[PDB]
Design a protein around this motif. Structure first.
Motif, PDB file in Angstrom:
ATOM      1  N   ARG A   6       0.826  -1.204   0.000  1.00  0.00           N
ATOM      2  CA  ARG A   6       0.000   0.000   0.000  1.00  0.00           C
ATOM      3  C   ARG A   6       0.864   1.259   0.000  1.00  0.00           C
ATOM      4  O   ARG A   6       0.633   2.191  -0.786  1.00  0.00           O
ATOM      5  N   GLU A   7       1.876   1.307   0.869  1.00  0.00           N
ATOM      6  CA  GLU A   7       2.712   2.511   0.877  1.00  0.00           C
ATOM      7  C   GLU A   7       3.485   2.671  -0.433  1.00  0.00           C
ATOM      8  O   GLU A   7       3.633   3.793  -0.936  1.00  0.00           O
ATOM      9  N   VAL A   8       3.982   1.573  -1.009  1.00  0.00           N
ATOM     10  CA  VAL A   8       4.771   1.728  -2.230  1.00  0.00           C
ATOM     11  C   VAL A   8       3.881   2.130  -3.404  1.00  0.00           C
ATOM     12  O   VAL A   8       4.315   2.880  -4.289  1.00  0.00           O
ATOM     13  N   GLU A   9       2.627   1.669  -3.441  1.00  0.00           N
ATOM     14  CA  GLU A   9       1.751   2.133  -4.511  1.00  0.00           C
ATOM     15  C   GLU A   9       1.366   3.593  -4.310  1.00  0.00           C
ATOM     16  O   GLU A   9       1.187   4.322  -5.292  1.00  0.00           O
ATOM     17  N   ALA A  10       1.262   4.048  -3.057  1.00  0.00           N
ATOM     18  CA  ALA A  10       1.113   5.484  -2.826  1.00  0.00           C
ATOM     19  C   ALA A  10       2.316   6.249  -3.371  1.00  0.00           C
ATOM     20  O   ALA A  10       2.170   7.322  -3.975  1.00  0.00           O
ATOM     21  N   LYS A  11       3.517   5.705  -3.166  1.00  0.00           N
ATOM     22  CA  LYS A  11       4.715   6.308  -3.744  1.00  0.00           C
ATOM     23  C   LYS A  11       4.625   6.356  -5.266  1.00  0.00           C
ATOM     24  O   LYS A  11       5.073   7.322  -5.898  1.00  0.00           O
ATOM     25  N   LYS A  12       4.070   5.306  -5.873  1.00  0.00           N
ATOM     26  CA  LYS A  12       3.879   5.304  -7.321  1.00  0.00           C
ATOM     27  C   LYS A  12       2.909   6.400  -7.754  1.00  0.00           C
ATOM     28  O   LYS A  12       3.126   7.062  -8.777  1.00  0.00           O
ATOM     29  N   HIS A  13       1.824   6.589  -6.996  1.00  0.00           N
ATOM     30  CA  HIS A  13       0.938   7.727  -7.241  1.00  0.00           C
ATOM     31  C   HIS A  13       1.725   9.028  -7.237  1.00  0.00           C
ATOM     32  O   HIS A  13       1.535   9.891  -8.102  1.00  0.00           O
ATOM     33  N   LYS A  14       2.595   9.190  -6.239  1.00  0.00           N
ATOM     34  CA  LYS A  14       3.381  10.417  -6.142  1.00  0.00           C
ATOM     35  C   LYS A  14       4.269  10.602  -7.366  1.00  0.00           C
ATOM     36  O   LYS A  14       4.340  11.700  -7.928  1.00  0.00           O
ATOM     37  N   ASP A  15       4.938   9.534  -7.803  1.00  0.00           N
ATOM     38  CA  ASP A  15       5.800   9.627  -8.981  1.00  0.00           C
ATOM     39  C   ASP A  15       5.004  10.031 -10.216  1.00  0.00           C
ATOM     40  O   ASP A  15       5.433  10.882 -11.007  1.00  0.00           O
ATOM     41  N   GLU A  16       3.836   9.417 -10.399  1.00  0.00           N
ATOM     42  CA  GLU A  16       3.057   9.655 -11.608  1.00  0.00           C
ATOM     43  C   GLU A  16       2.489  11.070 -11.631  1.00  0.00           C
ATOM     44  O   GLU A  16       2.536  11.755 -12.662  1.00  0.00           O
ATOM     45  N   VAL A  17       1.960  11.534 -10.497  1.00  0.00           N
ATOM     46  CA  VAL A  17       1.491  12.915 -10.452  1.00  0.00           C
ATOM     47  C   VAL A  17       2.661  13.878 -10.602  1.00  0.00           C
ATOM     48  O   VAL A  17       2.504  14.967 -11.165  1.00  0.00           O
ATOM     49  N   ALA A  18       3.852  13.493 -10.134  1.00  0.00           N
ATOM     50  CA  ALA A  18       5.026  14.333 -10.332  1.00  0.00           C
ATOM     51  C   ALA A  18       5.333  14.500 -11.813  1.00  0.00           C
ATOM     52  O   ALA A  18       5.581  15.614 -12.283  1.00  0.00           O
ATOM     53  N   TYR A  19       5.310  13.399 -12.567  1.00  0.00           N
ATOM     54  CA  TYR A  19       5.549  13.493 -14.007  1.00  0.00           C
ATOM     55  C   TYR A  19       4.460  14.304 -14.701  1.00  0.00           C
ATOM     56  O   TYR A  19       4.741  15.062 -15.643  1.00  0.00           O
ATOM     57  N   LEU A  20       3.211  14.150 -14.255  1.00  0.00           N
ATOM     58  CA  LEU A  20       2.136  14.970 -14.802  1.00  0.00           C
ATOM     59  C   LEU A  20       2.411  16.449 -14.565  1.00  0.00           C
ATOM     60  O   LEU A  20       2.194  17.280 -15.453  1.00  0.00           O
ATOM     61  N   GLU A  21       2.894  16.795 -13.371  1.00  0.00           N
ATOM     62  CA  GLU A  21       3.275  18.177 -13.101  1.00  0.00           C
ATOM     63  C   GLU A  21       4.427  18.616 -13.996  1.00  0.00           C
ATOM     64  O   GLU A  21       4.429  19.741 -14.509  1.00  0.00           O
ATOM     65  N   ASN A  22       5.418  17.741 -14.193  1.00  0.00           N
ATOM     66  CA  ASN A  22       6.572  18.106 -15.011  1.00  0.00           C
ATOM     67  C   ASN A  22       6.154  18.454 -16.431  1.00  0.00           C
ATOM     68  O   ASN A  22       6.644  19.431 -17.009  1.00  0.00           O
ATOM     69  N   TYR A  23       5.249  17.669 -17.012  1.00  0.00           N
ATOM     70  CA  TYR A  23       4.844  17.890 -18.395  1.00  0.00           C
ATOM     71  C   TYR A  23       3.486  18.577 -18.515  1.00  0.00           C
ATOM     72  O   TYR A  23       2.872  18.537 -19.585  1.00  0.00           O
ATOM     73  N   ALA A  24       3.009  19.212 -17.443  1.00  0.00           N
ATOM     74  CA  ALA A  24       1.702  19.860 -17.491  1.00  0.00           C
ATOM     75  C   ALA A  24       1.780  21.289 -18.019  1.00  0.00           C
ATOM     76  O   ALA A  24       0.886  21.728 -18.751  1.00  0.00           O
ATOM     77  N   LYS A  25       2.831  22.029 -17.666  1.00  0.00           N
ATOM     78  CA  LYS A  25       2.878  23.456 -17.964  1.00  0.00           C
ATOM     79  C   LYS A  25       3.235  23.769 -19.412  1.00  0.00           C
ATOM     80  O   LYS A  25       3.057  24.915 -19.837  1.00  0.00           O
TER      81      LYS A  25
END
Lengths: 26, 26
Positions: A6-25
């Protein structure tokens, strides 16, 4: 182990939203 | 139960990241 999964999949959520932020602007 | 839940989570994560990279490829 399943709690840890559960915690590592939460970390995966964090990574994926991070990439979305990187390529969002562009 | 935990294994199948992890599997569905992993596949939906990879689907999300594929969607994001496909969107950003332009």
């Amino acid at each position: 182990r399943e709690s840890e999964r559960r915690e590592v999949e939460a970390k995966k959520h964090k990574d994926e939203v991070a990439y979305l932020e990187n390529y969002a602007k562009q």
